[PDB]
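Hi R.,

Here's the input for the sodium ion complex you asked about:
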Amino acid sequence: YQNQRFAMEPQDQTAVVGARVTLPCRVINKQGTLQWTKDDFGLGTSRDLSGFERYAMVGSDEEGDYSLDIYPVMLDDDARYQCQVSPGPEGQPAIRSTFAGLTVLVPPEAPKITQGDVIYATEDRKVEIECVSVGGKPAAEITWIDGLGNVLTDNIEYTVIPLPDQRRFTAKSVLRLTPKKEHHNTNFSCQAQNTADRTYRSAKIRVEVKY
Amino acid sequence: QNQRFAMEPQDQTAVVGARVTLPCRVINKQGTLQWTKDDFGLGTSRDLSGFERYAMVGSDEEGDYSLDIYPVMLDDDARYQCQVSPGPEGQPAIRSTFAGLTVLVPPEAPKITQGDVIYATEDRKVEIECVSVGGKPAAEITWIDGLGNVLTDNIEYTVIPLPDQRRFTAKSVLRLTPKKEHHNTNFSCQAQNTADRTYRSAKIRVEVK
Ligand code: NA
Ligand code: NA
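And here is the predicted structure with sodium ion in place:
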């Protein structure tokens, strides 16, 4: 009845690198010691959380509020969190909150076309144009457009390559082009965007054609 | 220079009421040390308030923060890890290997369900049941005749989990065909689990008609 219990428990959240994120935890009739774990690692029991320079427990003691405040968010924060309270002095039972997953989003590097600024093609001599978006979490989507902003979906092969950290991804989109004679000095552009991006980013290449 | 372990805790087995100590020693300790029990943080002060039977023993000088438990209870059966947080200069955290503590529980005294005596009739098939309640693990049960011979035939040994899904009740049934010779003879069961210091016995006398 009077045993310590949660008024609020953390829920899954998603946040971009550099952002602030606060995982809620509030206790009614708090009796034991409160602590957050991160992937089952105890973060510590004092509000300043020494050892973790970007973490602190904020809120007032009177309200039982020990929310885990993270700023700035970094990729290393992508993990499972839990709010815990140890048993009370009279044996009031320990309590453990719902686990809360923090998903951290990472904007990719600027998209780049491997072939550079200009490609010198020959009519009917098939050629590859590769757009690359390095290190996004999640992988960036890539759209191709022609000289007039018409989206292409033909002759395009999109692939994803995980980075060694197994969290970030490099996205690649290959446009296989059969250079028509009219294609001379036309442009092709790729547009890359992941869910961390505020809008898409673009790269462009000019195509020259002989014959 | 990284903080690292000099000693990590290993799996141990202990009987309820015993003292058990899980080693953890740190070299170049920079961060704060803490134990977890089934991923619950036990606290970062040596007296571990909130856990009346736990404390971290050893000297700071030796980097020793072994988890001391006394008296051991069934609730201690769990997986433990020794953790040290990042240091002031960014020395990375360390986590020990996990150590499982297996707690053993002696069963209650064995009992024969038919009790003190069986008044039987010749060739009228009868069953004698020995029961050992509440052992972790389940007690093994051996049947012996009046001469002290282990009976290995006509025996059904079963194990039933208890409500807490940790302790077990062991039962062993001996199928007997009453014979004139079996008059006023004795049957004993001997029950023992790994927690027991020795076996415990119950005895039944059988009369034939
Ligand atoms: Na901190
Ligand atoms: Na304690």
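One thing worth noting: The pocket of sodium ion (ligand 2) is lined by residues B 47-49, 51-52, 54-55 (CB under 6 Å).

Cheers,
M.
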